[PDB]
Amino acid sequence: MCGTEGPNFYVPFSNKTGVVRSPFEAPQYYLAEPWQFSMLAAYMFLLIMLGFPINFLTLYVTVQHKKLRTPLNYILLNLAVADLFMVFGGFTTTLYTSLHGYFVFGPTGCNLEGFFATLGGEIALWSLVVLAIERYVVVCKPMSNFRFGENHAIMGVAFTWVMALACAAPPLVGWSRYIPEGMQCSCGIDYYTPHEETNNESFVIYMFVVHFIIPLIVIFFCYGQLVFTVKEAAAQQQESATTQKAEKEVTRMVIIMVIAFLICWLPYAGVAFYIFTHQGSCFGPIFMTIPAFFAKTSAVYNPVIYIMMNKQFRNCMVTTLCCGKN
Amino acid sequence: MCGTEGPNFYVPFSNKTGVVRSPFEAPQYYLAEPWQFSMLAAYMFLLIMLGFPINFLTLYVTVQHKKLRTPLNYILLNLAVADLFMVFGGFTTTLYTSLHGYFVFGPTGCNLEGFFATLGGEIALWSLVVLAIERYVVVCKPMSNFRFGENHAIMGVAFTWVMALACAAPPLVGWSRYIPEGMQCSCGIDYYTPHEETNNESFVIYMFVVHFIIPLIVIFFCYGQLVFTVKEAAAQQQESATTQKAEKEVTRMVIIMVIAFLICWLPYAGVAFYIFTHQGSCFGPIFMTIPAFFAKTSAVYNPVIYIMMNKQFRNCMVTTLCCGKN
Ligand SMILES: *C/C=C(C)/C=C\C=C(C)\C=C\C1=C(C)CCCC1(C)C
Ligand SMILES: *C/C=C(C)/C=C\C=C(C)\C=C\C1=C(C)CCCC1(C)C
Ligand SMILES: *[C@@H]1O[C@H](CO)[C@@H](O)[C@H](O)[C@H]1NC(C)=O
Ligand SMILES: *[C@@H]1O[C@H](CO)[C@@H](O)[C@H](O)[C@H]1NC(C)=O
């Protein structure tokens, strides 16, 4: 056969030699070379010793300063959290795995891995809708001045977690389930088995349609719009040129956080999807492992685009470290 | 300078030599080589001697036959019309142009060219929404059985023309305007000049947002969905396998008419857009001419995808010509 199905796992390696061991009992060294299983550990070790400070620091250059309290400093201080939940919640429990070539903590771990990745990913796709909608109600402003108050900011921030849990938690109680992917060292929604005691095929397309399509239809719609105004719906709507440089410094950043999201995450999907529909067609333990581990940088790059494309945040962040000021 | 603006035209060639003539008074042979202006004529002559029968024939294999009366035979018998409006309404008035190297009929023609192209394109982008929504209410069917009758079919067919005229007619009365593109032998909405006596900048993004973005957001949303069911939302919703081959023979075609639309039309946009925002940056008479003439095949290929991907239609179409039956 192609893979070797079990009670709670699936793998791209034929038990036609009877070698296959379940990814919860013994090493999966029979999938790739033992020099690679360490490579993951090293990569996963780098993102742990890189995501911890550049997200704890952004989760701190805000809590201290005062003038840093607008809709943007909120969403990027919210990623400052969702991401650290990725590191100690997921990455600690994922690096540790590769060093062993297979999960050890019992499936009672492939829940923190697969949960704290799906979670950090969803709080990052939805936090982008609340950011587009924000760029939309600021770039080509609609009606009366119910101007965003620190208030509606929380409303959208408490919004991402909620929505982001509608995708991640369901499979944690029994609406799908987290199972080992590619090399059995990265767990994600069971796009693998057809199982029926969790309606696997339902939750899966549920997840995809409200936490991929929709999430986007709101971003794309508010995308172009972030261009009508950076032109004529602005000449008539009179906008001082001392604001079409900051308010655009942000229309640019938001615009690069969206692309940045489609570069990193789309790939994992390219495979997660091909998997689902073409179930039963031989593939290896690298067909879903790169996209996974690659896309897994979803908890590192945002605080960066943010120090490299947002001066205000950057002049303060350099004021914190250097003590006093610059 | 870059181009040589006039009262009702715009061109990518510097009057820094004083050569430039208006695309409504004398030949524009000074933009490309006179061997090319004929090339357009020949290309435009081929699509005229190719789109006339394969659209008059589909606009006839339906009007006669009886068993050809369902939502799909309607939308593809509607393109059978919008397209012939492209040929004699637009192409006759556009081939004739290139043989002369510049418009002759007076701008009182760059209205039929630029109108009967925008029109044929809008009756084809919207007829795809009415086709996705249809695949959507048939692939992952919603509730109670109000199963469409020939009725709602017209509702959506009378729908495309209406919506498609919201894009094309406006510029014809004074909300934008049709002006010569690239080689002054293909007219399209004025993505060129900033003008103000037609609010050029408003209509343009209007046209883009409701006749590009939206039109798609309905197609894309109904796209994936055309996959939930071609899987599990169909096992529980019990669908005989003698229908999951015709009803899918159509989920495939519709799916190839959407890709086919993004291959052909997207390019013209890629430039029409870069033009608008980057107004004033030198470019030539080929930067907007290929996409235009290329994408201009939007009145030829659908009746084809239709004879090559829909057997019923094809077995009858071959029955008409061969007289009697096969
Ligand atoms: C490193 C391990 C990972 C990334 C494991 C699992 C990931 C998911 C279940 C991801 C889900 C998705 C997200 C967060 C965003 C785009 C759509 C998606 C379904 C692939
Ligand atoms: C050959 C000449 C042509 C195609 C001239 C003009 C075309 C337009 C004004 C096209 C408009 C568009 C359509 C039909 C569909 C996609 C979006 C669009 C605005 C480019
Ligand atoms: C095949 O794999 C299974 C489950 O992973 C294992 O228990 C079994 O012993 C292998 N086949 C045989 C014939 O031993
Ligand atoms: C430049 O172009 C214009 C109009 O297209 C033409 O009328 C004019 O005569 C040319 N320049 C000169 C100096 O003649």
Distance, first Cα to last Cα, chain A: 63
Chain B CB within 8 Å of residue A42 CB: no
The residues near A66 (Cβ < 8 Å, ≥ 6 apart) are: none
Residues 173-212, chain B: which have Cβ within 8 Å of A?
A: 201-202, 205, 208-209, 212
Closest chain B residue by Cα to residue A210: B221
Chain A CB within 8 Å of residue B224 CB: yes
Look up tokens 């059978």; give the residue: B80
HEC states along A4-35? Answer: CCCCCCCCCCCCCCCCCCCCCCCCCCCCCCCC
Distance, first Cα to last Cα, chain B: 63
What is the helix (H) or strand (E) element at residue B188, kind and residue range?
strand B187-189
The rounded Cα B65 to chain-centroid distance in angstroms is: 27
The answer to whether residues A35 and A15 touch, using CB atoms and an 8 Å cutoff, is no
Number of domains composing chain B: 1
Chain A CB within 8 Å of residue B227 CB: yes
Q: Is A180 helix (H, G, I), strand (E, B) or coil?
A: strand
What is the helix (H) or strand (E) element at residue B187, kind and residue range?
strand B187-189
Token representation of residue B65:
């036959």
**Nearest by Cα to B188 from B167, B202, B209:** B167
In this structure, which amino acid lies at residue A297?
T
The answer to whether residues A37 and A184 touch, using CB atoms and an 8 Å cutoff, is no
**Nearest by Cα to B112 from B203, B188, B52:** B188
The rounded Cα B38 to chain-centroid distance in angstroms is: 24
Instruction: Give residue B97's region: left, alpha or beta (phi > 0; psi -120 to 50).
Output: alpha
Token representation of residue A164:
């982001």
CA distance B234 to B57: 36
**Nearest by Cα to B190 from B4, B2, B11:** B11
Phi, psi of B108 (to 5 degrees): -70, 20
Is residue A232 annotated as involved in ligand binding? no
The residues near B196 (Cβ < 8 Å, ≥ 6 apart) are: none
Structure solved via: X-ray
Token representation of residue B87:
């040929």
Whether B202 sits inside 8 A of A232 (CB atoms) is: yes
CA distance A226 to A132: 9
**Nearest by Cα to B119 from B71, B174, B78:** B78
Distance A207 CA to ligand 3 centre (A): 33
CATH number of B139's domain: 1.20.1070.10
Chain A CB within 8 Å of residue B217 CB: yes
Phi, psi of B21 (to 5 degrees): -115, 145
**Nearest by Cα to A250 from A271, A226, A270:** A226
Residue A187, strand partner residues = A180
CA distance B259 to B120: 17
Strands B178-180 and A187-189: unpaired
Name the residue of B8, B9, B15 to mutate for ligand 4: max ligand atoms within 8 A of Cβ.
B15
- How big is chain A by its Cα radius of gyration, in Å? 22
Looking from the CA of B94 toward its CB, the CA atoms found within 13 Å total: 35
Chain B neighbors of A272, CB-CB under 8 A: none
The residues near B177 (Cβ < 8 Å, ≥ 6 apart) are: B8, B171, B189, B190, B195, B198, B200
Residue A179, strand partner residues = A188
The answer to whether residues B91 and B293 touch, using CB atoms and an 8 Å cutoff, is no
Helices A129-139/A214-224 angle, 10° precision: 20
- Sign of the Cα torsion A193, A199, A202, A207 reads negative
Phi, psi of A235 (to 5 degrees): -65, -40
Whether A233 sits inside 8 A of B208 (CB atoms) is: no
Token representation of residue A141:
């402003």
The residues near B194 (Cβ < 8 Å, ≥ 6 apart) are: B200, B201, B279
The answer to whether residues A122 and A168 touch, using CB atoms and an 8 Å cutoff, is yes
The residues near A120 (Cβ < 8 Å, ≥ 6 apart) are: A82, A83, A85, A86, A90, A298, A299
Token representation of residue B287:
């930067």
Token representation of residue B11:
């061109």
Chain A neighbors of B214, CB-CB under 8 A: 221
Domain of B98, in residue numbers? 2-326
CA distance B79 to B82: 5
- Sign of the Cα torsion B307, B308, B311, B316 reads positive
Q: Which atom of ligand 4 is the closest one to the Cα of B6? A: 5
